[PDB]
């Protein structure tokens, strides 16, 4: 029942630890700001290893109670504990990081105090350790400190956080550590600075390793992180296994797994012909079509899935096969259906883009017509055009998209009859006056397809298309000028 510590003696601290076990003396110890600071002082300066751990272990026991935390807190224990994270005694390290962990969990203001003490840099530097239980605690501290705190995220990045965390995911199998580390990566994955770094470290491939782990919380966190990372990332190697697993996960009974899988696949296939090839080769088209069908009106699933299908049906060696595969796997009816309510604009925009690609395949021309793609595309176009003449999706995008789809569909003679029968020529001619070059292009394009039929060519001329087409001959956009010349010729 004392309060005085004498230098050069291990007896004092050695006795103090023995008391912190018994809750009786322990409360007395933390009900007293006296020796608590003296405990800290001893730990912070003592070069006797055996004293340090006896000291740190004492503080650890105190961190189990609300006032014991406050005691350590108001006694300036946090900077001391942070300093102790440089200790070469594994026993001391464990107590330091654990006590800090407890403070971070419960003690108000501890998070800020640790950051100020330079705790982040020290913790990141400890990520090269090899004890999984120690790493699990350290990574948990990092997660707590990084969540909702951009300042901490940037510090973790500057300290080499991303590479160290990815190395952990590539190395260990301890679930608790893999889960907690993935949680840190998820928090960092929404940072515009951390994200490219995680990707460069090989983070996507590493996270892909655990997508078939029995732990659902691990799989889901890896999926959430992957969705963030895959958005407009640099081209990567070794993505084969990951892409394969993602396709498999599309058939999961877990909706969040399915939603993430579709989203990642969409992100990874956008303007990436290599990935498009791989996804198609492992049956990606069929899996995505089944996913869309099962999803119904759930646009959180259909939107990324349709986006992925749009990517897969364009600009790669097996694009044509993918275009046929959508039809062969009973996908055409549901695609047309998604153009109708209750579909919102992002889905509609994506669906229009998909139809445009599907129309590149001649064997899709008739089924798309039979399923009623043309009148709905025209109604969407007419209304979208009116809106532009009166934040999400701009109606200008819908105008360009629908006209673009009609341009491709107009390759078929029967489609041209349907398209013109819907009083579209006056609208297409008006779109020639659009300020947007891309709208001018598809407008002149569909008119060019239509004008190959004599009767339609006369109707285009009667609509007074000659004057704007002549102006478009001098368009800085070569595509616009080429189509404009082609229409003028056939007239």
Swiss-Prot record:
<dbReference type="GO" id="GO:0090425">
    <property type="term" value="P:acinar cell differentiation"/>
</dbReference>
<dbReference type="GO" id="GO:1990909">
    <property type="term" value="C:Wnt signalosome"/>
</dbReference>
<dbReference type="GO" id="GO:0005886">
    <property type="term" value="C:plasma membrane"/>
</dbReference>
<dbReference type="GO" id="GO:0042129">
    <property type="term" value="P:regulation of T cell proliferation"/>
</dbReference>
<dbReference type="GO" id="GO:1901331">
    <property type="term" value="P:positive regulation of odontoblast differentiation"/>
</dbReference>
<dbReference type="GO" id="GO:0048715">
    <property type="term" value="P:negative regulation of oligodendrocyte differentiation"/>
</dbReference>
<dbReference type="GO" id="GO:1990907">
    <property type="term" value="C:beta-catenin-TCF complex"/>
</dbReference>
<dbReference type="GO" id="GO:0098685">
    <property type="term" value="C:Schaffer collateral - CA1 synapse"/>
</dbReference>
<dbReference type="GO" id="GO:0005912">
    <property type="term" value="C:adherens junction"/>
</dbReference>
<dbReference type="GO" id="GO:0007405">
    <property type="term" value="P:neuroblast proliferation"/>
</dbReference>
<dbReference type="GO" id="GO:1904948">
    <property type="term" value="P:midbrain dopaminergic neuron differentiation"/>
</dbReference>
<dbReference type="GO" id="GO:0009954">
    <property type="term" value="P:proximal/distal pattern formation"/>
</dbReference>
<dbReference type="GO" id="GO:0001501">
    <property type="term" value="P:skeletal system development"/>
</dbReference>
<feature type="repeat" description="ARM 5">
    <location>
        <begin position="160"/>
        <end position="201"/>
    </location>
</feature>
<dbReference type="GO" id="GO:0045211">
    <property type="term" value="C:postsynaptic membrane"/>
</dbReference>
<dbReference type="GO" id="GO:0030855">
    <property type="term" value="P:epithelial cell differentiation"/>
</dbReference>
<dbReference type="GO" id="GO:0005634">
    <property type="term" value="C:nucleus"/>
</dbReference>
<comment type="similarity">
    <text>Belongs to the beta-catenin family.</text>
</comment>
<dbReference type="GO" id="GO:0019899">
    <property type="term" value="F:enzyme binding"/>
</dbReference>
<feature type="repeat" description="ARM 6">
    <location>
        <begin position="202"/>
        <end position="230"/>
    </location>
</feature>
<feature type="repeat" description="ARM 9">
    <location>
        <begin position="330"/>
        <end position="371"/>
    </location>
</feature>
<dbReference type="GO" id="GO:0019901">
    <property type="term" value="F:protein kinase binding"/>
</dbReference>
<dbReference type="GO" id="GO:0016922">
    <property type="term" value="F:nuclear receptor binding"/>
</dbReference>
<dbReference type="GO" id="GO:0007173">
    <property type="term" value="P:epidermal growth factor receptor signaling pathway"/>
</dbReference>
<dbReference type="GO" id="GO:0035050">
    <property type="term" value="P:embryonic heart tube development"/>
</dbReference>
<dbReference type="GO" id="GO:0030901">
    <property type="term" value="P:midbrain development"/>
</dbReference>
<feature type="repeat" description="ARM 10">
    <location>
        <begin position="372"/>
        <end position="400"/>
    </location>
</feature>
<dbReference type="GO" id="GO:0007398">
    <property type="term" value="P:ectoderm development"/>
</dbReference>
<keyword id="KW-0677">Repeat</keyword>
<dbReference type="GO" id="GO:0003676">
    <property type="term" value="F:nucleic acid binding"/>
</dbReference>
<dbReference type="GO" id="GO:0000922">
    <property type="term" value="C:spindle pole"/>
</dbReference>
<dbReference type="GO" id="GO:0061047">
    <property type="term" value="P:positive regulation of branching involved in lung morphogenesis"/>
</dbReference>
<dbReference type="GO" id="GO:0045177">
    <property type="term" value="C:apical part of cell"/>
</dbReference>
<dbReference type="GO" id="GO:0032993">
    <property type="term" value="C:protein-DNA complex"/>
</dbReference>
<dbReference type="GO" id="GO:0048471">
    <property type="term" value="C:perinuclear region of cytoplasm"/>
</dbReference>
<dbReference type="GO" id="GO:0140677">
    <property type="term" value="F:molecular function activator activity"/>
</dbReference>
<dbReference type="GO" id="GO:0045597">
    <property type="term" value="P:positive regulation of cell differentiation"/>
</dbReference>
<dbReference type="GO" id="GO:0061198">
    <property type="term" value="P:fungiform papilla formation"/>
</dbReference>
<keyword id="KW-0539">Nucleus</keyword>
<dbReference type="GO" id="GO:0030856">
    <property type="term" value="P:regulation of epithelial cell differentiation"/>
</dbReference>
<keyword id="KW-0524">Neurogenesis</keyword>
<dbReference type="GO" id="GO:0097718">
    <property type="term" value="F:disordered domain specific binding"/>
</dbReference>
């Amino acid at each position: 029942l004392n309060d005085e510590d004498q230098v050069v003696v291990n007896k004092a601290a050695v006795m103090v630890h023995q008391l912190s076990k018994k809750e009786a003396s322990r409360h007395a110890i933390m009900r007293s700001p006296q020796m608590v600071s003296a405990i800290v002082r001893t730990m912070q300066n003592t070069n006797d290893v055996e004293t340090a751990r006896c000291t740190a272990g004492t503080l650890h026991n105190l961190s189990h109670h609300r006032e014991g935390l406050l005691a350590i807190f108001k006694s300036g224990g946090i900077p001391a504990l942070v300093k102790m994270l440089g200790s070469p005694v594994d026993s001391v390290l464990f107590y330091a990081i654990t006590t800090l962990h407890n403070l971070l969990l419960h003690q108000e203001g501890a998070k800020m105090a640790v950051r100020l003490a330079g705790g982040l840099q020290k913790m990141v530097a400890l990520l090269n350790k090899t004890n999984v239980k120690f790493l699990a605690i350290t990574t948990d501290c990092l997660q707590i400190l990084a969540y909702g705190n951009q300042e901490s995220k940037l510090i973790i990045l500057a300290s080499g956080g991303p590479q160290a965390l990815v190395n952990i995911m590539r190395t260990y199998t301890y679930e608790k550590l893999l889960w907690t580390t993935s949680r840190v990566l998820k928090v960092l994955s929404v940072c515009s600075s951390n994200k490219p770094a995680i990707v460069e470290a090989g983070g996507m491939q590493a996270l892909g390793l655990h997508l078939t782990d029995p732990s659902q919380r691990l799989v889901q966190n890896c999926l959430w992180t992957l969705r963030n990372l895959s958005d407009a990332a640099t081209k990567q190697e070794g993505m084969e296994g990951l892409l394969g697993t993602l396709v498999q996960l599309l058939g999961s009974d877990d909706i969040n797994v399915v939603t993430c899988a579709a989203g990642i696949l969409s992100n990874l296939t956008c303007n990436n012909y290599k990935n498009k090839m791989m996804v198609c080769q492992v049956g990606g088209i069929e899996a995505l079509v089944r996913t869309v069908l099962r999803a119904g009106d759930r646009e959180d699933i259909t939107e990324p899935a349709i986006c992925a299908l749009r990517h897969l049906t364009s600009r790669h060696q097996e694009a044509e096969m993918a275009q046929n595969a959508v039809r062969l796997h009973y996908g055409l009816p549901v695609v047309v259906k998604l153009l109708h309510p209750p579909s919102h604009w992002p889905l509609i925009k994506a669906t229009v883009g998909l139809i445009r690609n599907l129309a590149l395949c001649p064997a899709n021309h008739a089924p798309l017509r039979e399923q009623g793609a043309i009148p709905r595309l025209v109604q969407l176009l007419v209304r979208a055009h009116q809106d532009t003449q009166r934040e999400g999706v701009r109606m200008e995008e819908i105008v360009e998209g629908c006209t673009g789809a009609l341009h491709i569909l107009a390759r078929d003679v029967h489609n041209r009859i349907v398209i013109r029968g819907l009083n579209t020529i006056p609208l297409f001619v008006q779109l020639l006056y659009s300020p947007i070059e891309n709208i001018q292009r598809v407008a002149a394009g569909v008119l060019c397809e239509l004008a190959q039929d004599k009767e339609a060519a006369e109707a285009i001329e009667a609509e007074g298309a000659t004057a704007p087409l002549t102006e478009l001959l001098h368009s800085r956009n070569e595509g616009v000028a080429t189509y404009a010349a082609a229409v003028l010729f056939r007239m």
